[PDB]
PDB file of C-alpha atoms in Angstrom:
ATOM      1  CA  UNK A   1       1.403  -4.842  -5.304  1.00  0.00           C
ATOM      2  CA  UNK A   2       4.245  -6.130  -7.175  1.00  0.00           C
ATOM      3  CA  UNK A   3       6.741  -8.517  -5.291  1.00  0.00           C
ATOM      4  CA  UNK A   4       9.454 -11.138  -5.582  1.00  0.00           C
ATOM      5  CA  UNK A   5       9.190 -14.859  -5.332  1.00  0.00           C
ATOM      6  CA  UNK A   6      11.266 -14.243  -1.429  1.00  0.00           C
ATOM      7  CA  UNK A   7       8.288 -10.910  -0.948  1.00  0.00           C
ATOM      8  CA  UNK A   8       5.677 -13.555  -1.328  1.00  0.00           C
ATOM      9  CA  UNK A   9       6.590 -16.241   0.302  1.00  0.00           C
ATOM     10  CA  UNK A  10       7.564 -14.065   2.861  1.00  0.00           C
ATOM     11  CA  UNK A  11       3.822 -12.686   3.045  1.00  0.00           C
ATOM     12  CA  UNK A  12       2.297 -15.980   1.966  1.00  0.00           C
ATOM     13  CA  UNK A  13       4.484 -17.365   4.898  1.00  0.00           C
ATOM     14  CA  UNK A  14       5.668 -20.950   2.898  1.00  0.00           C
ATOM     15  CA  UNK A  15       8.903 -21.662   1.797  1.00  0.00           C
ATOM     16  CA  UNK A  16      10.258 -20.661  -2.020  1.00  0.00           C
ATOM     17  CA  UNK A  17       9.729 -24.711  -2.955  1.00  0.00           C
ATOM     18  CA  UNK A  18       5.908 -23.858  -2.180  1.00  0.00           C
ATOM     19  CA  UNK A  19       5.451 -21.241  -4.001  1.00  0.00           C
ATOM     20  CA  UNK A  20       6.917 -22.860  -6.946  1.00  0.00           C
ATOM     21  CA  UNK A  21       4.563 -25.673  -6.447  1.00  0.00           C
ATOM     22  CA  UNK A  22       2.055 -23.044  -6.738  1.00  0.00           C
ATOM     23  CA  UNK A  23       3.422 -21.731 -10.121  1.00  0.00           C
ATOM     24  CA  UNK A  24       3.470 -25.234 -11.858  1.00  0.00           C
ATOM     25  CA  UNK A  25      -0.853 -24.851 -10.763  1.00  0.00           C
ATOM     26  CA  UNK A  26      -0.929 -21.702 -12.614  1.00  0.00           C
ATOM     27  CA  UNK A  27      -0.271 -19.306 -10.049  1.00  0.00           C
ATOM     28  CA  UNK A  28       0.445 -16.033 -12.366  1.00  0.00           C
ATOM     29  CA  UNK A  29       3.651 -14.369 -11.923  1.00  0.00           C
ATOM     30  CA  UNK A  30       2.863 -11.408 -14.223  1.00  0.00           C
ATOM     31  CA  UNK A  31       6.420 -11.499 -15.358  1.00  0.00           C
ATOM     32  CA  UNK A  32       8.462 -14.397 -15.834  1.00  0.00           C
ATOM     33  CA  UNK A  33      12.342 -13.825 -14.238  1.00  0.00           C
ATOM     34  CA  UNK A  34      14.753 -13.741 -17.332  1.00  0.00           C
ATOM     35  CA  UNK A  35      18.303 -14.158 -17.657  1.00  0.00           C
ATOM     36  CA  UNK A  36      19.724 -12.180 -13.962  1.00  0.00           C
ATOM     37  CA  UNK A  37      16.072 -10.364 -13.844  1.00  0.00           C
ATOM     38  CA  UNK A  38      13.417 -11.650 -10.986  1.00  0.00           C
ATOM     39  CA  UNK A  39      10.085 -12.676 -11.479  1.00  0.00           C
ATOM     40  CA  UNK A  40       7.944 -10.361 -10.451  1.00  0.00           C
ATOM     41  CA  UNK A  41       4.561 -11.649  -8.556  1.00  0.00           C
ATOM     42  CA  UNK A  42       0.944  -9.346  -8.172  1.00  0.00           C
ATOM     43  CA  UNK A  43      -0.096  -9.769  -4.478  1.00  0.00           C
ATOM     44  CA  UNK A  44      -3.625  -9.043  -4.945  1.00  0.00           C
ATOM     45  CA  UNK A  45      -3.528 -11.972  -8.468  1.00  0.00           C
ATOM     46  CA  UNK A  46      -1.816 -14.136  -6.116  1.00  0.00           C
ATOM     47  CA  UNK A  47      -4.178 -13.780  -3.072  1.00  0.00           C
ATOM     48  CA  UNK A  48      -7.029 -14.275  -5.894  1.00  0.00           C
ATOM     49  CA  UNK A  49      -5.661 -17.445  -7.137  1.00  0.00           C
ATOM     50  CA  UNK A  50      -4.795 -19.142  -3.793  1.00  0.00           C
ATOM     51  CA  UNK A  51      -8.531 -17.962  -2.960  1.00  0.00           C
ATOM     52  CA  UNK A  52      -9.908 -19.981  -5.797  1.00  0.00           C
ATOM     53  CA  UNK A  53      -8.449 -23.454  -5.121  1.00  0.00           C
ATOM     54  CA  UNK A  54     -10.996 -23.545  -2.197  1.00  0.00           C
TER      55      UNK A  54
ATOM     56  CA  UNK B   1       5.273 -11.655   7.918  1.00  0.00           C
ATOM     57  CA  UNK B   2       3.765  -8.615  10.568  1.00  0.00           C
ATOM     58  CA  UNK B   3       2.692  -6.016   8.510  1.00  0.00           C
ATOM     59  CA  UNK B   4       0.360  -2.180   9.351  1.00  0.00           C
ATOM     60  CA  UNK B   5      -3.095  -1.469   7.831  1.00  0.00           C
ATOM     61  CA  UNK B   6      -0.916   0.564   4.823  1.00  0.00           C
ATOM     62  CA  UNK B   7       1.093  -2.119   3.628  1.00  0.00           C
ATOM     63  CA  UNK B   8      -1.980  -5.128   3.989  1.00  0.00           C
ATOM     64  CA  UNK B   9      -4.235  -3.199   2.070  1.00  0.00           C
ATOM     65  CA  UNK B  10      -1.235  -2.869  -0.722  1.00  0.00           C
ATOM     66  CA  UNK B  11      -1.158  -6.558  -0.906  1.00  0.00           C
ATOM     67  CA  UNK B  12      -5.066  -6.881  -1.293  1.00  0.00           C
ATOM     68  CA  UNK B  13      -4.675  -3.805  -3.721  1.00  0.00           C
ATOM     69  CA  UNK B  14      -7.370  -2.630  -1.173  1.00  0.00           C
ATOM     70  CA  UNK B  15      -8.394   1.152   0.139  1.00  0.00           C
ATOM     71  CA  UNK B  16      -6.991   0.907   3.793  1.00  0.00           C
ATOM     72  CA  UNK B  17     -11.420   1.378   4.245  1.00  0.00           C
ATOM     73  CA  UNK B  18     -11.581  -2.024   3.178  1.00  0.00           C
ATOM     74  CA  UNK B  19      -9.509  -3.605   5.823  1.00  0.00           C
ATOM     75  CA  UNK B  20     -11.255  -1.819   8.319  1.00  0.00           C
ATOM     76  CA  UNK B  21     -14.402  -3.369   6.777  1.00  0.00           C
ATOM     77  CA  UNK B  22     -13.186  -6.930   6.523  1.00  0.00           C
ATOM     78  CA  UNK B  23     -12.114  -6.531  10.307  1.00  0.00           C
ATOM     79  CA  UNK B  24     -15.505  -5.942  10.990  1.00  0.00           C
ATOM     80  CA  UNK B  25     -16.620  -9.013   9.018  1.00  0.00           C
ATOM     81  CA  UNK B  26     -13.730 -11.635  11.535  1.00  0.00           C
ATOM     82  CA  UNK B  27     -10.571 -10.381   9.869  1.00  0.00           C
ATOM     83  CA  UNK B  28      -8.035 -11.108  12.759  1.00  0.00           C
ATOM     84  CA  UNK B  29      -5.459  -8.261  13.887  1.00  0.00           C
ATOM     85  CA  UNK B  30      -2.252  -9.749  15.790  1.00  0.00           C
ATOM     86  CA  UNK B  31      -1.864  -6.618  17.335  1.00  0.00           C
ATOM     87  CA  UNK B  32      -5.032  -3.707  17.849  1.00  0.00           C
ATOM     88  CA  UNK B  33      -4.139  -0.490  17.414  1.00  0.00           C
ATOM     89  CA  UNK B  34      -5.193   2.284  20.095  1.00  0.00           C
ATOM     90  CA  UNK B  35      -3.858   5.351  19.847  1.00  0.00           C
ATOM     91  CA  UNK B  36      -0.628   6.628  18.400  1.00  0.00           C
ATOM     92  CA  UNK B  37       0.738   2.764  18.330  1.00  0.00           C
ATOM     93  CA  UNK B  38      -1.060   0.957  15.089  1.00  0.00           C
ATOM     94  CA  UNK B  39      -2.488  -2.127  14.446  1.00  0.00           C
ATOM     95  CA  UNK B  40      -0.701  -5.085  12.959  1.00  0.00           C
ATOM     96  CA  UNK B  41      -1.788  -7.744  11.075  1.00  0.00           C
ATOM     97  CA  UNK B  42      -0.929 -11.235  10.218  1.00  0.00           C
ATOM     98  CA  UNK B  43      -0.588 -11.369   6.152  1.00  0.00           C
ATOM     99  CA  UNK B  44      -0.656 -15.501   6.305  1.00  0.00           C
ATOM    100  CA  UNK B  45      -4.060 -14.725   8.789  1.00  0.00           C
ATOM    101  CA  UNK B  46      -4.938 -12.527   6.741  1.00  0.00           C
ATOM    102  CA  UNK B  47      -4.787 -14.988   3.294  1.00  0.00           C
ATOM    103  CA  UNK B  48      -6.124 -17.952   5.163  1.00  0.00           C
ATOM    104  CA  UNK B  49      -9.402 -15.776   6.393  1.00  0.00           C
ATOM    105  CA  UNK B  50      -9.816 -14.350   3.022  1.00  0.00           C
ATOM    106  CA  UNK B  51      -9.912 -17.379   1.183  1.00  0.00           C
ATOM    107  CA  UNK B  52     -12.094 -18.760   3.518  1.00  0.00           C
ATOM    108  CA  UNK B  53     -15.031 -16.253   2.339  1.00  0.00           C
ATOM    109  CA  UNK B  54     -15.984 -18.212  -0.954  1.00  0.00           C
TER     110      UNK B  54
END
């Protein structure tokens, strides 16, 4: 499901600064947050990815 | 964060069926549901478990 960066860290329980780290190793964010919008996160791509690095 | 059967199986993009399955398989539940009450799982638990499969 679609999320924000505070959704997922939220279910991912890590802080923001993690998650971040996690987007610089090319977790997707299936929108990137322009200009007073969000980025918006996929749950399911994010679980995926995570899933992969082990 | 503590979420139901409903909303983990939105993260996975999942039929709540799969959950059940992956339960079956060592998926841990914080909280068993009974009866009328519901079961509640641990979305970090959940993750960790997950990517432990491959």
């Amino acid at each position: 499901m679609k999320v924000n960066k505070k959704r997922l860290a939220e279910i991912f329980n890590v802080d923001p600064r993690t998650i971040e780290r996690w987007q610089s190793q090319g977790l997707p964010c299936a929108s990137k947050g322009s200009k007073g919008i969000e980025s918006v996160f996929d749950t399911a791509m994010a679980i995926q990815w995570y899933a992969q690095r082990e």
